[PDB]
Symmetry: C2
Subunit: 154 residues, 2 copies
């Protein structure tokens, strides 16, 4: 379920104030970031972000996406790219594959995510600030229950 889906198969999340997105069920294995870029936008990147606590330790996890054009980015929730333990106001990168499994396992059960646009540049390569002014719209969806059923079976 990594190919973008037909209109009736998309369960869209609801965007909060601040860059949060909330769904009416667990996110599961695949999220989709649907971006319409502004006309003079050459490049954008950002992430879907999550936090979890395990055994008294706190973690921040990011799934990085990028695009050079209006597109849907298919995000694999098994495949986070940036994982840090946050110790007070310091960070420590996490490499332990067991910890990382544990984190994604939890994440796949969460109903909300942070949606963050970190960086954007125009067609000349000049930075667009704030970065989210570089998109006309950004939305996030997950597969409908019906879509998940078909995937599977298959």
């Amino acid at each position: 379920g990594l190919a973008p889906l037909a209109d009736g198969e998309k369960l869209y999340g609801k965007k909060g104030s601040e860059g949060t997105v909330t769904f009416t069920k667990a996110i599961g294995d695949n999220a989709f970031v649907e971006i319409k870029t502004g006309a003079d936008t050459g490049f954008m990147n950002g992430c879907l972000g999550f936090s979890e606590s395990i055994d008294g330790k706190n973690y921040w996890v990011a799934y990085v996406w990028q695009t050079k054009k209006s597109d849907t980015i298919s995000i694999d929730m098994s495949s986070p790219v940036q994982i840090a333990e946050i110790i007070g106001t310091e960070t420590q990168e996490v490499t332990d594959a067991d910890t990382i499994k544990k984190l994604t396992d939890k994440i796949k059960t969460e109903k909300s995510a942070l949606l963050q646009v970190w960086y954007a540049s125009d067609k000349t390569g000049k930075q667009i600030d704030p970065a989210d002014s570089a998109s006309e719209s950004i939305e996030v969806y997950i597969p409908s229950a019906s879509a998940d059923e078909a995937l599977e079976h298959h």
Copy 2:
């Protein structure tokens, strides 16, 4: 150190996790948090991006609190710096690269304001994390305050 009401230049919050100021951020930012009644802990960051010599960077200044407070952030002292290469990241240690980044950040008029994690008094996670605060605002010193060295 905290500062008086008439000396605070507040940033304007933008719907999507951004804060924008009417002048460059400069050396010091302040994150002013009012926590909800059942909140035990919150952390997050002020976030920036820059490009240097064809490479793209994300930079975060982490803050945390257990109570309503103002967190004073030193723009010279980012805690998380990554180069973003496609959908991979690489940690950045070079103090030189870092200095270039902070120099640029100090001239920016906007920041990302992100609340990443929060837990209640029992230690149970509050989700979304920003529901754990009644208000979060960011300010920088007024021109007059800066003039005071």
